[PDB]
Amino acid sequence: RKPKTGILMLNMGGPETLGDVHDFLLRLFLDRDLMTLPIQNKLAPFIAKRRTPKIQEQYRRIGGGSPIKIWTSKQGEGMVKLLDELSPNTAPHKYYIGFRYVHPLTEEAIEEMERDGLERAIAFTQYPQYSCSTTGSSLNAIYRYYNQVGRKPTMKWSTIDRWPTHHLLIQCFADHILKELDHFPLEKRSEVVILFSAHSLPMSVVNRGDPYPQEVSATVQKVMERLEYCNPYRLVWQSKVGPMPWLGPQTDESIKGLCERGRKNILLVPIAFTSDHIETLYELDIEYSQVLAKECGVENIRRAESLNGNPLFSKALADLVHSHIQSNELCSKQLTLSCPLCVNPVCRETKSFFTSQQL
Amino acid sequence: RKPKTGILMLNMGGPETLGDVHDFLLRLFLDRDLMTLPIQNKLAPFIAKRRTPKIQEQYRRIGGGSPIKIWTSKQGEGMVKLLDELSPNTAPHKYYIGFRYVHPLTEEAIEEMERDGLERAIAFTQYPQYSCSTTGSSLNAIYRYYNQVGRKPTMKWSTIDRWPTHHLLIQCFADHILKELDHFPLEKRSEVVILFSAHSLPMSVVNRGDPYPQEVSATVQKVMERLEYCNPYRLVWQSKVGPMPWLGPQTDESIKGLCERGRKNILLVPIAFTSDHIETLYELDIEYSQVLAKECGVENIRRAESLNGNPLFSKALADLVHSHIQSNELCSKQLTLSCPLCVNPVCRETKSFFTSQQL
Numbered sequence: 268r269k270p271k272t273g274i275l276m277l278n279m280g281g282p283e284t285l286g287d288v289h290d291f292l293l294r295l296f297l298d299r300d301l302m303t304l305p306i307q308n309k310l311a312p313f314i315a316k317r318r319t320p321k322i323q324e325q326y327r328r329i330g331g332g333s334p335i336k337i338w339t340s341k342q343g344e345g346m347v348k349l350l351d352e353l354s355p356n357t358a359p360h361k362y363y364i365g366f367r368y369v370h371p372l373t374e375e376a377i378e379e380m381e382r383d384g385l386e387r388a389i390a391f392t393q394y395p396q397y398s399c400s401t402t403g404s405s406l407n408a409i410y411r412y413y414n415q416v417g418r419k420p421t422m423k424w425s426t427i428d429r430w431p432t433h434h435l436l437i438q439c440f441a442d443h444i445l446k447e448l449d450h451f452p453l454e455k456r457s458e459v460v461i462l463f464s465a466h467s468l469p470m471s472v473v474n475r476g477d478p479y480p481q482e483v484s485a486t487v488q489k490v491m492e493r494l495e496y497c498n499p500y501r502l503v504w505q506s507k508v509g510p511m512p513w514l515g516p517q518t519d520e521s522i523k524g525l526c527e528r529g530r531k532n533i534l535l536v537p538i539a540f541t542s543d544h545i546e547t548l549y550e551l552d553i554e555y556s557q558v559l560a561k562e563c564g565v566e567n568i569r570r571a572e573s574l575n576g577n578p579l580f581s582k583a584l585a586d587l588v589h590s591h592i593q594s595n596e597l598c599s600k601q602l603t604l605s606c607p608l609c610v611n612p613v614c615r616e617t618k619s620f621f622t623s624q625q626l
Numbered sequence: 627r628k629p630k631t632g633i634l635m636l637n638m639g640g641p642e643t644l645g646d647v648h649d650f651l652l653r654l655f656l657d658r659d660l661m662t663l664p665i666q667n668k669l670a671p672f673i674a675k676r677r678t679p680k681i682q683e684q685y686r687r688i689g690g691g692s693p694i695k696i697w698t699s700k701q702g703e704g705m706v707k708l709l710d711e712l713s714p715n716t717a718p719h720k721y722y723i724g725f726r727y728v729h730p731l732t733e734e735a736i737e738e739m740e741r742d743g744l745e746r747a748i749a750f751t752q753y754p755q756y757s758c759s760t761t762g763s764s765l766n767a768i769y770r771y772y773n774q775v776g777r778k779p780t781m782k783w784s785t786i787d788r789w790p791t792h793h794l795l796i797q798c799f800a801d802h803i804l805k806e807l808d809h810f811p812l813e814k815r816s817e818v819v820i821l822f823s824a825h826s827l828p829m830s831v832v833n834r835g836d837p838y839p840q841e842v843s844a845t846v847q848k849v850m851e852r853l854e855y856c857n858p859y860r861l862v863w864q865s866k867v868g869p870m871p872w873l874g875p876q877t878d879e880s881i882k883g884l885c886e887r888g889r890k891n892i893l894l895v896p897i898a899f900t901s902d903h904i905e906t907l908y909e910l911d912i913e914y915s916q917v918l919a920k921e922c923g924v925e926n927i928r929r930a931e932s933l934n935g936n937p938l939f940s941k942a943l944a945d946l947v948h949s950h951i952q953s954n955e956l957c958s959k960q961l962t963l964s965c966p967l968c969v970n971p972v973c974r975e976t977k978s979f980f981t982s983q984q985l
């Protein structure tokens with residue numbers, strides 16, 4: 268039977284093999300939205316060529332590539348399976364992967380969905396907390412696609428642009444935190460400090476009004492309320508790059524600061540991404556937890572397991588789509604408000620693309 | 627009969643009259659935990675003298691003084707009437723006002739509480755969201771008092787150091803937002819953009835690990851969930867002073883930014899303070915919502931009423947103290963964790979002061 272409802276899972280993605288690193292970076296330094304460089308059409312290929320060696324080396328340290336596609340596919344298969352039983356009126360359901368910087372690209376996914384003659388398409392961001400640099404970029408790509416291809420969508424669109432406090436996402440995080448707490452020696456369990464870590468943002472982005480920090484913060488509170496405030500905590504930020512000011516505290520400085528102040532039992536919790544990637548496997552596990560940890564002498568530092576293939580996460584994904592469908596919403600109320608200091612004209616067009624959908 | 631349980635309501639305070647300004651600024655500039663100045667004992671008095679006129683002028687624009695003590699007293703009286711009925715066993719309760727920088731000073735209040743021969747003392751911060759610069763400072767003052775007077779307390783201490791998501795606090799905020807939305811012309815009600823505004827912090831404080839931003843963000847989320855996300859919103863920050871980097875977006879820049887982008891119906895919501903003060907009466911009402919709103923024609927800009935004398939807020943206070951008593955807690959779990967990059971030696975001693983209290 269023909270696919271009726273399409274679910275486009277959006278993520279920035281990552282290179283599957285070391286050889287995909289160059290093109291991954293090239294597309295990154297070419298995204299007019301997220302970056303502005305003089306004659307960016309010539310600087311990009313150059314910069315990409317320069318950073319490739321260093322980035323390839325990071326992925327080599329974690330096994331040779333990104334596992335995002337593998338986990339995305341599995342979560343997607345589990346979601347569809349549940350949806351066909353949750354919403355028969357919109358079945359059969361089919362998931363598509365739309366990576367912003369690697370294959371399958373957002374554009375390629377859209378072409379395929381259109382080919383499958385779907386009745387409705389749902390842009391489902393895999394980023395629970397909204398950032399104009401992540402979900403916004405992916406949504407802009409959908410608008411730009413149809414605008415460039417000079418055509419109108421043959422299917423009905425709508426978007427699940429954020430879900431920072433979905434009860435099942437919160438339950439998943441809490442469950443992974445609790446089981447990681449069981450791996451610390453029992454005599455130090457209540458002494459453990461929880462560090463929620465999320466990818467940072469340059470202060471120029473935070474200062475224009477990006478929704479991200481406030482939403483990541485909201486996720487942290489829900490998770491801690493569910494854990495009944497069993498351990499003390501702080502929300503810190505990682506992955507800062509360059510000489511410009513980024514939102515802090517920085518995760519690495521915090522780990523080291525805590526140790527120097529007698530808190531040597533730390534639990535790291537990636538609270539802003541749903542699966543393993545360079546941020547957790549390399550940055551946290553290798554850069555920090557190993558080298559940095561082997562410094563100021565930590566007693567125990569562990570990292571909560573990423574959601575990955577957790578069956579309960581697949582249920583969360585399905586419940587979100589199901590609720591989205593019965594709600595008949597086109598996008599969140601939050602998407603109807605661009606950054607108070609937004610200076611990108613595509614943002615407004617993208618918003619209208621969704622709020623203006625037929626039906 | 628004599629008071630059995632004392633509730634010390636902590637706030638930074640504000641000058642009652644124009645004449646109290648100078649001493650207000652002086653105590654501020656002499657505080658070593660908040661400010662490091664060369665030959666401070668020399669400069670402090672001087673700077674105080676220089677900035678007094680400019681700040682007296684600000685208070686003159688709002689009536690000649692701060693109403694903080696009036697509202698704090700009203701809230702305190704209401705809280706006590708309820709406590710005496712909610713917790714008969716904790717005999718008569720009495721509230722004391724402990725302002726950090728104005729009379730009645732924290733020290734003076736503690737002196738009176740101990741003169742009253744109280745059995746139990748509760749350091750109740752009036753800041754829902756914890757900041758080392760606000761609640762932290764007030765708690766440090768309690769510890770320093772006993773360390774200075776070279777004696778130990780004659781009362782059993784404990785603290786309510788934060789309550790960012792208390793259900794009744796949330797209901798009060800939501801109720802005031804809704805009633806204010808009713809004051810907008812009906813045709814622009816759903817077009818209204820909600821700007822939650824909280825006092826900002828220097829990025830140097832944020833980057834050391836201050837809990838404030840994340841807690842303020844948590845309060846915004848609960849208020850919006852209770853409002854069922856009826857309108858779009860953003861959390862912005864006000865009161866920045868100086869050339870250094872502070873956490874943005876800045877409230878004024880956001881108001882101007884929104885207008886220039888077609889969103890001319892705005893509802894300001896002071897989300898980090900419980901009563902009117904210089905921040906709302908002067909900053910938001912005068913320098914922003916009046917002048918700023920005279921360059922880029924705004925259609926409607928209103929400000930939700932501060933909690934002030936709302937009866938439901940007195941009930942929230944009483945409920946917090948009552949729950950605190952029934953739980954036997956000495957402080958939140960969060961206070962047992964100082965900033966990852968904390969560089970103030972007193973912070974650890976202050977926390978120990980509370981976690982080590984008898985019984």
Ligand code: HEM
Pocket residue numbers: 279281282292295301318322325398400401466467468469472508539540544545546
């Ligand atoms: C808000 C502004 C942001 C900027 C400017 C930014 C910038 C960048 C840049 C330049 C890279 C390439 C770094 C390199 O090649 O060494 C990168 C990679 C990446 N970013 Fe972002 N990013 C932002 C936000 C985010 C967010 C919110 C996430 C979500 C977790 C994220 C996740 C990643 C990941 C997973 C990579 C791949 C790194 C690698 O493969 O080595 N980024 N980002």
Ligand SMILES: C[C@H](CCC(=O)O)[C@H]1CC[C@H]2[C@@H]3[C@H](O)C[C@@H]4C[C@H](O)CC[C@]4(C)[C@H]3C[C@H](O)[C@]12C
Pocket residue numbers: 303304305310314
């Ligand atoms: C001036 C511009 C900042 C853009 C802005 O206003 O935000 C910055 C951003 C990217 C920078 C470039 C990239 O970092 C790549 C190169 C790095 C080299 O060390 C200097 C030249 C180099 C070619 C940089 C020149 C200049 O500092 C750039 C072009």
Ligand SMILES: C[C@H](CCC(=O)O)[C@H]1CC[C@H]2[C@@H]3[C@H](O)C[C@@H]4C[C@H](O)CC[C@]4(C)[C@H]3C[C@H](O)[C@]12C
Pocket residue numbers: 301302303314317318469471508509510511
């Ligand atoms: C780290 C990287 C330099 C690559 C390299 O030469 O090794 C540089 C090149 C382009 C830079 C970006 C661009 O200058 C655009 C943005 C400028 C903002 O002030 C900070 C974030 C911002 C998004 C920059 C982040 C970072 O400094 C980048 C990504």
Ligand SMILES: C[C@H](CCC(=O)O)[C@H]1CC[C@H]2[C@@H]3[C@H](O)C[C@@H]4C[C@H](O)CC[C@]4(C)[C@H]3C[C@H](O)[C@]12C
Pocket residue numbers: 662663664673
């Ligand atoms: C250098 C120091 C910053 C402290 C620090 O954060 O490291 C700043 C804080 C207070 C400043 C002083 C106060 O603003 C008072 C004076 C203001 C005058 O315009 C300049 C001299 C003046 C006497 C300032 C000298 C210098 O800029 C000071 C002393």
Ligand SMILES: C[C@H](CCC(=O)O)[C@H]1CC[C@H]2[C@@H]3[C@H](O)C[C@@H]4C[C@H](O)CC[C@]4(C)[C@H]3C[C@H](O)[C@]12C
Pocket residue numbers: 638654660677680681759760825867
């Ligand atoms: C009044 C003075 C402004 C100097 C001037 O331009 O005249 C400002 C500058 C820094 C301010 C302080 C800082 O923002 C730190 C604290 C922030 C809290 O929300 C209130 C007390 C608090 C301790 C502030 C008191 C007062 O508003 C200060 C001291």
Ligand SMILES: C[C@H](CCC(=O)O)[C@H]1CC[C@H]2[C@@H]3[C@H](O)C[C@@H]4C[C@H](O)CC[C@]4(C)[C@H]3C[C@H](O)[C@]12C
Pocket residue numbers: 660661662673828829830867868869870871
């Ligand atoms: C110490 C703190 C953070 C410094 C930083 O960002 O590294 C800074 C930020 C804002 C500063 C204050 C503001 O600039 C307002 C006042 C300016 C006067 O010249 C000195 C006192 C004054 C009240 C400053 C004291 C101190 O330098 C503050 C409080």
Ligand code: FES
Pocket residue numbers: 399403475476477604605606609610611614
């Ligand atoms: S950059 Fe946030 S809406 Fe445009």
Ligand code: FES
Pocket residue numbers: 758762835836963964965968969970973
């Ligand atoms: S400055 Fe935050 S605990 Fe010391």
